Structure formats: C-alpha cells, structure tokens
Amino acid sequence: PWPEARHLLNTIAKSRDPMKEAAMEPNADEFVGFYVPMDYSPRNEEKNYQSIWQNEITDSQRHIYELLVQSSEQFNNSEATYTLSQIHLWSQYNFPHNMTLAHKYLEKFNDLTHFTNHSAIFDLAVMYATGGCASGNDQTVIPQDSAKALLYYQRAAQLGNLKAKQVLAYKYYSGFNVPRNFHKSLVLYRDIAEQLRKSYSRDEWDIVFPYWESYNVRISDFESGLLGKGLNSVPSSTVRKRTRRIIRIYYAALNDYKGTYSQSRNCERAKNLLELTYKEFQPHVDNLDPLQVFYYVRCLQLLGHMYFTGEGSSKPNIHMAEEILTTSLEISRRAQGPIGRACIDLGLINQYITNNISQAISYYMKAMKTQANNGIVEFQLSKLATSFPEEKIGDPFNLMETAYLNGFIPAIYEFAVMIESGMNSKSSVENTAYLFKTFVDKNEAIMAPKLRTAFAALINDRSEVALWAYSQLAEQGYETAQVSAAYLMYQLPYEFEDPPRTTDQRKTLAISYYTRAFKQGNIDAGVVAGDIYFQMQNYSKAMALYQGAALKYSIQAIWNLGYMHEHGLGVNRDFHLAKRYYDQVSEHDHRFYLASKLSVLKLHLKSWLTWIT
Ligand SMILES: *[C@@H]1O[C@H](CO)[C@@H](O[C@@H]2O[C@H](CO)[C@@H](O[C@@H]3O[C@H](CO)[C@@H](O)[C@H](O)[C@@H]3O)[C@H](O)[C@H]2NC(C)=O)[C@H](O)[C@H]1NC(C)=O
Ligand SMILES: *[C@@H]1O[C@H](CO)[C@@H](O[C@@H]2O[C@H](CO)[C@@H](O[C@@H]3O[C@H](CO)[C@@H](O)[C@H](O)[C@@H]3O)[C@H](O)[C@H]2NC(C)=O)[C@H](O)[C@H]1NC(C)=O
C-alpha cells in the first residue's frame, strides 16, 4: 500500500507558498484588510467540510487518500497514520483540516513506540492544554488538562527538543500556573543558548548574521488596530520604504533585496539590474544632479554589501567589491554623503582577508556614530580589545553594553556570559535571564519558523490552521502570537450591530492570551479583556483589570471606568470620582476636550431630574 503512495505524494507537489510565487512575477503590490470571520459556527464547518470533500477534491486525490487510510487500518504501517495527522492538521497537501481525527490518529502514532518522537507528542500536548480543539460532541472529547500536557512537555525536554524547554522556561518566568522560580529558567535558557551558538559557524557567527526574514508582527495592525485609530501604541509593521529616473529604480531594488511581508526576496534580478546600472552610468559621470548621485552611491553601498554577501552568486567576490566600493568612497569625498556600510564591510574585509588591523580601527571608528551602526562595530572591536590589550579603544564591557540595547543579536550572548561570569557583582540575577530569552526569542528561525507558515497559509484561506500555529507559539513567549490568535478568536464588534456568536470555552482561552499579552506590555489588550466581561459577569474582575491598565496611562480604560460606575453594576453608586476620571482624560490627551464635558453634561442632567422629586 504505502510505497506506491510515495510516488503519488511526490507527484502532487504540495506545501505551496504564494510569496515565493510572487517573488518573480510582476504583481499587484496590493493587499489589505483581506477577510476574516467573526463567528465560528462549529456545526457549519462540518457541512463545509462535507461539501469540499465532496466536490472540490479530485477523484484521484480521493484514490490516494483511499488506501493509505484503508491499508493502514487493515495494516499496522504507522508511517501513513503519522502522515495523515500532518495532512489533516496542516492542510499540507490540498485537503481540509479536521482536528478530531487528527488528534485521534496522534495517539495511534504515539502508542506505537510510546514516548520516543518529540516532534509529535508536543503537538498534541498543546491540544490538551487548549481543550478547544480535539473537541466536538462524541464521547472522547475532553476539556483542558494542564498536568497531562505538562508531563509531555517534560518528556520532550527530557528528550531534548528546544521549544519545549523554551515554553517551560517562559512558564516559570511568568508565573502562568506554577510559581516564579527564576533559577530553573536561567538554567534551561543558557542550555538552549549554547545549543543555538553551536548551530552556527565561527565565521558566520563573527562576520554576518544571515538575515532571516521576520514575521514577529502584530496582526490587526494591517487594519486600524486592536482598537480604533490614534489611541493605540507601537505598530510593528515595517514595509515598503519610500520618500529623477533612478531613484524609482533604487527603492525598487531595495524592496526586492528586503521585501519582508508579502513578497519573498532574493537579489538575483535586483543584482543583474544593478550591475547593469554600474556598467551604464560610470563614463557618464559628470555632476549629474547631486540628488541623483546620492542614490547612485547608496546603491553602490548596497552593491558592495552584495558582492561581499554572496547572494545570487555561487560565491562572494571580495575584489570587485573592493574596487567598486572604494571607488564609491572616492566619490563620497565629493558631496560628503553617507558612507557607513562601506566603511563597515571595508573595515571588515581588511580584518579577515588582509590583516591591517590598524586602518580597520580607523574605519570602524570613522563610522561608529553612523545610524546604520546597529551593534556590529562595537562587537567587532571588543574582540580585538580582548585579543590585543591596547589602550586606544577602552573597555570591552562598555562597548558590548552599547551593542546590547541596539538589537544586534550576537552581542547578547557575549553580553550575557560576561555578566554571569562577572566576579564584579553587577545589578542582579534575574535580569540575566531577561537577556537569554531576549536572545532566544529573537533568533526566530530555529525556534519559530512557522510564522512564515501561519501568515502564509492564512491569506490564501483557512485561518484555523494559522490559529493553531499561534496557539502553538502563544505558549512560547511571543506576544505577537497571543494577540494574533486572540484577534482571530474575538474581533471587536462595532457599537451598532451585534457581538459575536461564538463558544464560551473559546473566550476562556482568548482572555488568557490577551491577559498574558497585557503583562508583556500591550496595554490595549487589557481594555479588550474588559470588553469581554461586559457581556459576562465579573464586573469586579474587569474593574480590577481596567484599573490595572489606567495606572500605565491609557484613556479608554478611564471612560469605561466612569461609565461602569455611572450606569451598569457598581458596588456603591457615586459621581464625585467619576467626573474626576472623566476630566483627567482631557487633562492628559488635550484632544478629547469635548466628550469629557459631554459626559459631564449628561451627568448633571441626571441631577436636574433627580432634584425634581
Ligand atoms: C471530521 O471527520 C469525521 C470523520 O471521522 C466526520 O464525521 C462524520 O460525522 C457525522 C456526524 O456529524 C457522522 O454521521 C453520519 O451521518 C450519516 C448520514 O448523513 C450516516 O449515514 C452515518 O451512518 C453517520 O451517522 C458520519 O458518519 C461521520 N463520517 C465520518 C467519515 O467520520 C466529520 O464530519 C468531520 N468534521 C469536520 C469538522 O471536518
Ligand atoms: C517522527 O517520525 C517522523 C516520521 O513519522 C520522522 O520523519 C523523519 O524526519 C527526518 C528528518 O528529521 C527525515 O530524514 C530525511 O528524509 C529525507 C526524505 O524525506 C531524506 O532524503 C534525507 O536523507 C533524510 O533521511 C525522515 O525521512 C523522516 N521519516 C519519514 C518516514 O518521513 C521524524 O523525524 C520523527 N521525529 C524526529 C524528531 O525525528
């Protein structure tokens, strides 16, 4: 039965990505506010499943699905049962998802060699910790079970999977259910981090971090926001830079060198395009519009970084890089333009291909205040400080401390192993842990490569699988996944029409995600949690929550606060404090000057009537 099917699943060519398909082609360059549901309708998904598995499937595509499943039930293969979980849980080939049967077959895979394969036990160990999926109406449905999942996590990390021991460390570090226990968190964090540092090369560790494309972004920022407009915080989308022929080309290659969200990147067509430009312009180099040559030499900076990169080619060329960018500075003398990244990679290639350290300090130091310096320079210097104890440069400590904050990633590890090893007792113990996770969570490719899946396999269709993915990273320390999944589980109804028509369990999960996101910083989520409990009871819990938000300077919390005391369930009714709240909103913002005193108008309109009796 099976080994014939291997030819078929070879034939079908699944696990499709659209951004790779839009990398090459001319395209709309256009997407926003695409589509979402607001109600789940469990018994609707079953009939939709029925329709699609009736019609849109192919008769062959049934034929393959026929006998792996028919052969696996007749035969104990256990390889097809593992695949169909990854097919009805991932929708990896063109088939629907059904977490009931997927969950059902996962125990079958596990029982075959109970507790050996960490890649699977983890996946259902989440499924226990939710209770929302692997659910239904038949008998085997069970709600959430903490400990029964917890043990499986311990089995995986005991076996040695990474993100398991990650989520344990986060779970202690946050005080999710168990106590705080910073010590353990430190232990397994540093363990993880040494394994990560072992994943890389010496060369690749020291010279360039390889630019894995980032998706740790807070969905609902594409639309207005988690709430409204103007009264939000920190939109994390970073897309499609822009501010006279060539400049429209310049950006048009930059976007192709680092297209981040909706179109995959690679340099090759941008590169060929670029070298065409250098072969084109160079003899025709008079003045030529000092604003144009600006973007010319900027594309030269880029270009030299690309030859030294080795993108698109089989190898990098240090040499044509050398002539081309050294030329670039030969111009940059004239018009005194930006010079940074050329000074970096020039001071870097001299540092490992040649061995004139001396000038290399001159270049690094010549570009050190540059904005493009993230942390790379300092991290590269402190090496030479610890190697060559020379007075010229200062302490390694302060330099690496100037690289930590800026975001350059290797800087953390040295900055961490330093302080823990420090016979000099620096600030504390717990802060040390904050470093390690901040490294871990930021490497983002070994640990969390599925953000490129969840996003991707959302936009075509079928949010639910992305929802499971964020429901697999929300347990990790990724705020973005928490508010993402919750924003999929509960959208805010507009004031007019209607709240949703969803499950109560589902809300019991969403609220937990929003809460943890709140205590990772996103104040707005707190507000949203309160807007759940309007529809429920627990007005006291909500009041504590809102009140928890207001102390950190929000606004909507406050209007809800005065409004909760004036109308609805208040333990004591009072409008003295109320107008204070309603007025300090206008104290702080200066922009809602009217609605404050409007609330005052209705508030005294109460008094006019009540004096009648
Ligand atoms: C997930 O997969 C299961 C299959 O394990 C799908 O199950 C179907 O569930 C219905 C009850 O909702 C079962 O009822 C059947 O009704 C027909 C008449 O319509 C009757 O002739 C059968 O004897 C039975 O009573 C149905 O047998 C069952 N079929 C299968 C293959 O399981 C379920 O619909 C899927 N859900 C989702 C959300 O994908
Ligand atoms: C849990 O079990 C699954 C199978 O149910 C294991 O899948 C195996 O994963 C490894 C890679 O981690 C695959 O290795 C590579 O496969 C390709 C062909 O697909 C081959 O060309 C490479 O040389 C290499 O052997 C392996 O084939 C794959 N096995 C099956 C049947 O798909 C999974 O690895 C197990 N979990 C863990 C954590 O290992």
Ligand SMILES: *[C@@H]1O[C@H](CO)[C@@H](O)[C@H](O)[C@H]1NC(C)=O
């Ligand atoms: C390179 O080093 C040699 C000897 O170390 C020195 O003579 C030469 O001036 C250096 N060149 C540059 C460009 O720094």
Ligand SMILES: *[C@@H]1O[C@H](CO)[C@@H](O)[C@H](O)[C@H]1NC(C)=O
């Ligand atoms: C109130 O909140 C608790 C959570 O502490 C929850 O278990 C309970 O179901 C809620 N009750 C109502 C009526 O909302």
